[model samples]
Target: FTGKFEMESEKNYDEFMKLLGISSDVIEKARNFKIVTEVQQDGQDFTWSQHYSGGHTMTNKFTVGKESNIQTMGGKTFKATVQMEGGKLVVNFPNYHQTSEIVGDKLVEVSTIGGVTYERVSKRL
Candidate 1:
């Protein structure tokens, strides 16, 4: 199955980056960078990888946190405590840097600083 959605607001990339406390140079690099991520679930474990534009990339493997929140789009949010293990960057979103609440089976969250919205989507096999 396939699903799609859109996120729209008056906010631009610059504003969003500023709110995230990302430096201008980082923002520039990010803008020019091509990001690719892949997520996979096997049994009770999950793994993912992130690739950047400058050929820099990181991989992470983690398990779902006990605490979870639902998003407006019906996706689940869990605190991920991501770190680097060996050559991979392990990610865990245990605490968000913004305000969040459970809405349906998804998490409806907004950034504490910029008021930007974040939505997550997921599918099960």
Candidate 2:
């Protein structure tokens, strides 16, 4: 959870993006792009980042158990509180909620909305 991780596998990705109202063309392009997630943890503070293709990166800085403003890659802004539950980071977005945890050497993230879940697994890089 405090290092760079490269995407290994994803489940329900296309459907998840579709629910987010992403265009099909962009979704197809995104399907081929590998995502890299970088996390920095210090006490209750954290800096989380996602590196996409073409040098695009989205990052958020927040403190655990405190409310913070968050901006998604799609430019949507929302207020959410980062919480630690059973060692996993959980937060809510406009359309979905996400949970992240380090499982062994792998980082597992899950986003769920409308009963559909998108799971992404990343290995430490």
Candidate 3:
């Protein structure tokens, strides 16, 4: 339930973005940012932080099945429901949705928006 994850690879992201049909500039900036996620969990409460290449960090603390504030990949703040389902973290980020879990030493997420899906694979670091 606790891990540090580093984004090592991504796929189908452009397809997902094209479906949304906006935010090309946002995707450009996101490409420049390499992301690392650190997680600390105590029961259902979790503290998750993202470390980025630009040197700024964003953190969100939330409990499973609860609504909380989180930063979007585009760096905008929003409220969303984060839950644990079948051992995976399901994040319903309004316009964005993702299910993430650890498989072996890898943390993987498949995110969907507007009928397109993006896959993120992160390794323990």
Model 2 lDDT per residue over 57-90, tens place: 9999999999999887657778999899997999
Cα-based TM-score, every candidate: 0.46, 0.94, 0.82
**Ranking of models by lDDT:** 2, 3, 1
Taking the tens digit of each residue's C-alpha lDDT, what string does model 1 give over 11-85? 255676676576999778665544444456564455545455566656545554333332311133444443334
lDDT of each: 0.41, 0.91, 0.82
Model 2 scores worst on lDDT over the 10 consecutive residues at 69-78
Over 4 Å off in model 2, which ranges? 93-95
Clashing pairs in 3: none
Ranking of all predicted structures according to TM-score, beginning with the best and ending with the worst: 2, 3, 1
Q: Write model 3 residue lDDT over 1-125, tens digit each, in one string.
A: 48889999998876776676658887776676789988899998998888889778888888887788887545668788888888799987657788888888898889888667899899998
Best by TM-score: 2
